[PDB]
Amino acid sequence: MSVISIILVVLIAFLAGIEGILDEFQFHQPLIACTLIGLVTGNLTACIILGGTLQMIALGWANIGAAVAPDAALASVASAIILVLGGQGVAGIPSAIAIAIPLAVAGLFLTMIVRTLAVPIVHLMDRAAEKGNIRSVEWLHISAICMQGIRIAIPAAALLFIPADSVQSFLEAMPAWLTDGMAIGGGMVVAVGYALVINMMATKEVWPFFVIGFVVAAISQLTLIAIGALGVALALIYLNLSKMGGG
Amino acid sequence: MSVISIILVVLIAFLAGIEGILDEFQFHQPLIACTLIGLVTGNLTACIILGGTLQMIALGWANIGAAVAPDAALASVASAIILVLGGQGVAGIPSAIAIAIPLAVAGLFLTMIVRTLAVPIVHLMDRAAEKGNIRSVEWLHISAICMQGIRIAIPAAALLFIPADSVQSFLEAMPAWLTDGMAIGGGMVVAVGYALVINMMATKEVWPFFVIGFVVAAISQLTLIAIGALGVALALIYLNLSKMGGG
Amino acid sequence: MSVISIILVVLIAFLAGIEGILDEFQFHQPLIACTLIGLVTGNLTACIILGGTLQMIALGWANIGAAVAPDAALASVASAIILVLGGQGVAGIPSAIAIAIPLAVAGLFLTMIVRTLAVPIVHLMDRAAEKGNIRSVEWLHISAICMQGIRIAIPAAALLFIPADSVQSFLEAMPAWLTDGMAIGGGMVVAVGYALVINMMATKEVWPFFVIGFVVAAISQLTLIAIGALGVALALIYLNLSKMGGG
Amino acid sequence: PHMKYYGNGVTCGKHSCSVDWGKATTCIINNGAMAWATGGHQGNHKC
Amino acid sequence: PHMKYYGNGVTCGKHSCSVDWGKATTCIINNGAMAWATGGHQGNHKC
Amino acid sequence: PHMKYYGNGVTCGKHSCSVDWGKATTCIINNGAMAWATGGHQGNHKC
Amino acid sequence: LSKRDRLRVAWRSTFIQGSWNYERMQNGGWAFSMIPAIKKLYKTKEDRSSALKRHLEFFNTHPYIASPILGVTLALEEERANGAEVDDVAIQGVKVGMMGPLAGVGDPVFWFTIRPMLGALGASLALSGNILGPILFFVAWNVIRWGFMWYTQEFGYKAGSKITDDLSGGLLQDITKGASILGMFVLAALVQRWVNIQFAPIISKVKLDEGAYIDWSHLPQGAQGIKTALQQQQAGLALSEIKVTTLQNNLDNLIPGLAAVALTFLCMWLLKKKISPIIIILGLFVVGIVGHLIGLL
Amino acid sequence: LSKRDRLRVAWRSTFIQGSWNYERMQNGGWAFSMIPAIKKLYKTKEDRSSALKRHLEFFNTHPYIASPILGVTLALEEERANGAEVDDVAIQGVKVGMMGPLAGVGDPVFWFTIRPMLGALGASLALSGNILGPILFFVAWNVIRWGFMWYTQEFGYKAGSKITDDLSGGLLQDITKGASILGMFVLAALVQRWVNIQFAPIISKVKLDEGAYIDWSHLPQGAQGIKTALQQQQAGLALSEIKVTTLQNNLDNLIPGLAAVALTFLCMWLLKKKISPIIIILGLFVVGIVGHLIGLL
Amino acid sequence: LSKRDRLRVAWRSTFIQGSWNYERMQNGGWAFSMIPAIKKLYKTKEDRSSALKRHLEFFNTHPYIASPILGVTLALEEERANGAEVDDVAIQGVKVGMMGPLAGVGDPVFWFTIRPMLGALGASLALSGNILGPILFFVAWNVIRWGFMWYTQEFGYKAGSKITDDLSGGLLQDITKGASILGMFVLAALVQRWVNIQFAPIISKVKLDEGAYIDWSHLPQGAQGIKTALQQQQAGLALSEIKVTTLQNNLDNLIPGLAAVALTFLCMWLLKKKISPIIIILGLFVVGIVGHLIGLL
Ligand SMILES: OC[C@H]1O[C@H](O)[C@@H](O)[C@@H](O)[C@@H]1O
Ligand SMILES: OC[C@H]1O[C@H](O)[C@@H](O)[C@@H](O)[C@@H]1O
Ligand SMILES: OC[C@H]1O[C@H](O)[C@@H](O)[C@@H](O)[C@@H]1O
Secondary structure, three states: HHHHHHHHHHHHHHHHHHHHHOOOOOOOHHHHHHHHHHHHHOHHHHHHHHHHHHHHHOOOOOOOOEEEOOOHHHHHHHHHHHOOOOOOOOOOOHHHHHHHHHHHHHOOOOOOOHHHHHHHHHHHHHHHHHHHHHHHHHHHHHHHHHHHHHHHHHHHHHHOOOOOOOOHHHHHHOOOOHHHHHHHOOHHHHHHHHHHHHHHHOOOOHHHHHHHHHHHHHOOOOOHHHHHHHHHHHHHHHHHHHHHHOO | OOHHHHHHHHHHHHHHHHHHOOOOOOHHHHHHHHHHHHOOOOHHHHHHHHHHHHHHHHHOOOEOOOOOOHHHHHHHHHHHHHHHOOOOOOHHHHHHHHHHHHHHHHHHHHHHHHHHHHHHHHHHHHHHOOOOOOHHHHHHHHHHHHHHHHHHHHHHHHHOOOOOOOOOHHHHOOOOHHHHHHHHHHHHHHHHHHHHHHHHHHOOOOHHHHHHHHHHHHOOOOOOOHHHHHHHHHHHHHHHHHHHHHH | OOHHHHHHHHHHHHHHHHHHHHHHOOOOOOOHHHHHHHOOOOOOHHHHHHHHHHHHOOOOOOOEEEEEEOOOHHHHHHHHHHHHHOOOOOOOOHHHHHHHHHHHHHHHHHHHHHHHHHHHHHHHHHHHHOOOOHHHHHHHHHHHHHHHHHHHHHHHHHHHHOOOOOHHHHHOOHHHHHHHHHHHHHHHHHHHHHHHHHHHHHOOOHHHHHHHHHHHOOOOOHHOOOOHHHHHHHHHHHHHHHHHOOO | OOOOOOOOOOOOOOOOEEHHHHHHHHHHHHHHHHHHHOOOOOOOOOO | OOOOOHHHHOOOOOOOOOOOOOHHHHHHHHHHHHHHHHHHOOOOOOO | OOOOOOOOEEOOOOOOOOOHHHHHHHHHHHHHHHHHHHHHOOOOOOO | OOOHHHHHHHHHHHHHHOOOOOOOOOHHHHHHHHHHHHHHOOOOOOOHHHHHHHHHHOOOOOHHHHHHHHHHHHHHHHHHHHOOOOOOHHHHHHHHHHHHHHHHHHHHHHHHHHHHHHHHHHHHHHHOOOHHHHHHHHHHHHHHHHHHHHHHHHHHOHHHHHHHHHOHHHHHHHHHHHHHHHHHHHHHHHHHHOOOOOOOEEEEEOOOOOOOOOOOOOOOOOOOOOHHHHHHOOOEEOOOOOEEEEEHHHHHHHHHOOHHHEEEEEEEHHOOOOOOOOHHHHHHHHHHHHHHHOOOO | HHHHHHHHHHHHHHHHOOOOOOOOOOOOHHHOHHHHHHHHOOOOOOOOHHHHHHHOOOOOOOOOOHHHHHHHHHHHHHHHOOOOOOOOOOOOHHHHHHHHHHHHHHHHHHHHHHHHHHHHHHHHHOOOOHHHHEEEEEEEEHHHHHHHHHHHHHHHHHHHHHHHHOOOOHHHHHHHHHHHHHHHHHHHHHHHHHHOHHHHEEEEOOOOOOOOOOOOOOOOOOOOHHHHHHHHHHOOOOOOOOOEEHHHHHHHHHOOOHHHHHHHHHHHHHHHOOOOHHHHHHHHHHHHHHHHHHHOO | OHHOOOOHHHHHHHHHEEEEOOOOOOOHHHHHOOOOHHHHHHHOOOOHHHHHHHHHHHOOOOHHHHHHHHHHHHHHHHHHHHHOOOOOHHHHHHHHHHHHHHHHHHHHHHHHHHHHHHHHHHHHOOOOOOHHHHHHHHHHHHHHHHHHHHHHHHHEEEEEEEEHHOOHHHHHHHHHHHHHHHHHHHHHHHHHHOOOOOOEEEEOOOOOOOOOOOOOOOOOOOHHHHHHHHHHHHOOOOOOOOOOEHHHHHHHHOOOOHHHHHHHHHHHHHHHOOOHHHHHHHHHHHHHHHHHHHOOO
């Protein structure tokens, strides 16, 4: 691989790292990141296929409050890089897809670590605000942006100087009990994401609706859309009945 | 068959056509029409059995608003006539029953055609009312009654001078795709009958009850009587809560 | 068996009969009655096992209003007595357990008969109250207590001078249709216990909740705790909506 | 196929017609309940 | 037949009696919930 | 085992990846309905 | 008007459905049944025409439950001949105020309560060849129908004023509201359960992995294969190695009965577009035929 | 009255269920428990008799939760001896206003919350032959029972006035209303699920057409017959060629549990007819026996 | 400030998520986007510092829906430079009154409504190797995002006063109440259905009596054994002679999803104890690992 290709893939990884936290231009989405990585290396169509497949997989990965998303950015960069420097243009896609999912969790851990690390940054920003320095706050904000960019710029450059079957080998040389524990713990994480919401909105007036929803969910013949429609109807009836005696 | 029998069966068909719309003396019901047809022809007991069977089948055929019923009158007249002029007094009943059902749909189409045709009649009645002529309105009303009587008097007389296995032969010599399309379209017709009701009674405060009913209907363990009881209980609770703050 | 053992077992039977109605010291519970009857006879551990097993069985036998409990007292006394005077200390327990259940129903019948008979007692207490005699009322109350004590003191002494396999023989030499009729009738008795409650609390505004509960109970995927939680949520919503227009 | 079904518990087999009255009574009761709940607007359904 | 059931998770087979405590605890919890929901009027049911 | 499932109707077999669009559309619609009903708080679930 | 005129009105009211046009359903029969009353009250050249225009407006209710309204219409109109200043005020109001709620109770009572039981009772005797069945049905229906019409018309006429103003009352509106709620609920259930729209296109035929189907080629042979197959089916394994998913399965994955409710809403929109129900029914038949032809249905 | 009189009343209150007649359940025990208080307050010839009539009226509650009421009855009565113009005004009202709601919480607490767990704990040790089980159960139940009675009786006596008028309050009304709603709901569910009435008459035995049953006479032989039978069962085909419909099936076609709720309503009517529950229970046993004899049940 | 300063603020607002600390999520980006406005209004030494403290408080909403709020913050702040006596009154009011309800609608709109459909449309072309997929997705997302941000910021700045006081209105509170009820219902359903906690300890293995299992050792042989086994399974008899009951079965006997709701409430308590969500997630992973190691999960 040419050195210019290495420079461009590192720059694309940095851009994906920045847009993982910015989440505005969507340079961190697989549909863009994979084709950007494959365009600067010659593996254009294969990376387009990989990006399309991963985007089809990662259609619902969104950050909501403190519940961070599986961070499709690191998967998009790293799976595409491993596909590029491993041959097997089109036939190697199922391996990149297979290795992307645990690397998404790894990127989630990394971005959680960096968001935790961002707290002293805003503390220094407050301390500089008390001093009346308007430019150092901007400097610290840009440093925070660059930290999240580096968060992905580093692993993508590390992958470039190791054999292709290194992430896959590490994943395969992993004890089965660890894999099963991770799988079990991954189904209980979403509960935390629910708890944050429940803490936001929970009053003595709406808890009975929570009880009714929990009871109703045990009926397997009712779909999720049916449960949502029942909730909408109940809320509408409650609102209609509340303002019939008040006014 | 004697000519006097022909005269009486045509008269009974005319009476059934009249009571198809009048719906008071119930001369159009199978229980009366079949025995009236068989009494003037000598096939008394066989036509009584046929009328009883058809009435057991046609227990719920009632005209409600613009949702016309399957018009048991034409089936009752024509199946009885075909049973009479085909031999096989008691053993021919399952053929008359089999041919009655599509002929009920044919009579339904005919009666909707005549109900559509009745609109210019009441237009002429209005134009005569503005002229102050009190007898021409009556004459138009009697003409409208006689038109619906003829609606069934004609097919019953047409069936008399054709071979018995003519309706059955026509029904059997029908393409399978047409029969299947009619069967499929017959399950969606009742929806129209529902729509007319929904257009009548539908407010922004009762739509949530429609949503709850639609969601609840997906639970197969709940019977229709159970759903009705749930609706009654919900309506009672809503009424009780409505006048707890209003007064 | 020594005569002193007979005296002690009769005394314990009398105490269990008294505590069947008193229901304070719980001398009528199997856990106490069985070990008391076995301690004065030398069969300590076997009677302790039998009492533990029967208490595990009779965990929910409680008198609630006029719905009398299966009267665990007579079973606890009699099954333990038959175990004591039949040999087979530990291995004879499943026979005592098997014969206890019908004898519980027999004790229920006996205690219902005595509760019915207690009405003239309080009538005499009233007639003594109108005469101003304060001690005769106490005497009648103690006589009523002693009557229910004797209700179990008598059968336990009768069982003492008959062969051990007499209750079991009588139960086995019973026609199958009678046993099946009793089993069928035992599943319908609890309805009476429900009726007494419904007659207590039933207004025109809570009947819809009864209808909803009856309809909902047909859904087998909802547990009894789920139904209770749904009822609590519905009651809370109803209470919240009731005092939003009233005040 | 020779045993058709016409609703309300009517069979009308190849040789005779028979009515099972339990299904007929169930159909009548259900149709009446639906008519009373909807004001007689339940439509025609083969029960 | 030699394995009877007496409720609350009591078997009392032909030779010995055994209690499965999961079923007994489930019966206790369900009976308590029904009593608290009905004011102790749920009646005696073989759980 | 060689036919894995990755959610949203993606298979990615041992040789190629294919998407069945009915399941993908069902997943999209269900996720959107849950997000609109919960304000976008339904979490990440493999549909 | 004496009792004779009311008797003629009642007898003439049995042809109230004689025309039954789709635009104004029972206007013709209602106008026909009021002809003798109009002739008895108004006589010169013009008040008869005005009465005809009044009674030729839209009217629709259960034919038998229309007798009390007529009585009210008999009571209120007779004042106008004498003079009571109530002209075009309540004569139109009572008709629309009673045609709906009275039909909502008369249709279940006569069409779906009395008639089904009478027909079943008559057919019970008729299936044995007894002429008593049809005769009993005819007599029982006729006597009840005529007695109901006459009694309710007389009650409505005699209570002409006591009931025209009591319509604006808490009982009537409470009944209407509860009936609306119950009807919405039950009609939603009936739309979901009785409107049958089944699609039969096959969407996907993805094969299952070799760990999820029963694989009836390496199974125990004799009295154990059945047991292990049942145990695997209890574990959730599939009978066939290929999984077939239809469009109906995908539609039910969202919510059951979505096609039925969508068709119902489309029918409501078409009816609101002032399209006659006959055209909609004839188009639904053609739609079913076409869908069967193209394999959609 | 001194603390000794209150302790004597509390000790005598453990026999409050001694008579338990069916007409006035705990009237005898309640009158028995108040004997020393009546003797302490009223002494001449007549006020004792009036107190006896006052305390011989209908009374029923959980036996342990009756202690606070007694305390209130101890406080209200002691004024009458001194004189407070409150005679038969509130002494009767507090008993009725407390016997219901307090029983509704004492029955679940003692009969179904403390006793089941204490019995399970004792039986755990008793099943191994340990005498510690029954001893622990006896001591833990009796200490708690006596402490509860004494403490609540003292609290009710000391708070005699503070609680007789607080009964007419929003909190008690809300608790009663919510308890009524929850009880109606759960009792309806229990009537549906726990009242077992199963009929076993066979109504119809119409045979199925030769397109609906599996027809186990022309099936694949060996490892394929099972698969095709399972596929046909999944398709909705019937196992047997004859369809048997029972009375229970027809009853469930209307609504499950109809017989149970009908029997419950009949029992309610019989109880409202002032028929004792013992007669109704004995009649239900005879009804079950007869129904099994005639094959109905 | 002119339109140039507003466009500068809008462009600088695309980095509003640059820091995203866990304690005050978007405070840094919000303060960054207000730098040119603060420099334009306050200029000496101290009002800039007070503005920095004002805009460094807690802020969190959907990044694209933060533009209207910014506009309001641009409208309200500009008065303070001129002087309007509204200082620290509403600047902390509109932000907290808008960050919640506006995020609750912007998260479903952009993250789960526009983005999934755009990504699916792009992937449709991308799976065939067409570069038009990613290009279409990129352009369609970015044009819409920038247009929405600019238009909503301009609308918020122009209608700065018309919307700050209209927040206290019936429509907003009604929407909030209905959204809270719907969210509680649907989140309870999602806790029950999507939180997967399956225990695998075996609790009891009591064998069944010889009248309850199919007993595959004395069964018909050939085309009849299958039928009789299916009929026995329909009767409710079990396949195996031993009955296995797990901890999950006993937990489901009480109510399904009890472990899920218990874990959710424990997480709620831990979050209320001011414990960061990262610690709770890392502890849940370790808990799952341990539970699999000890056989609990
Ligand atoms: O309720 C509507 C009522 O009026 C319609 O015009 C007729 O179909 C009647 O049979 C029906 O009962
Ligand atoms: O709650 C009613 C209460 O009084 C009844 O008379 C007795 O059965 C008690 O055991 C019961 O607790
Ligand atoms: O609604 C919450 C909103 O703010 C969070 O900090 C970010 O994760 C956003 O992506 C999210 O949309």
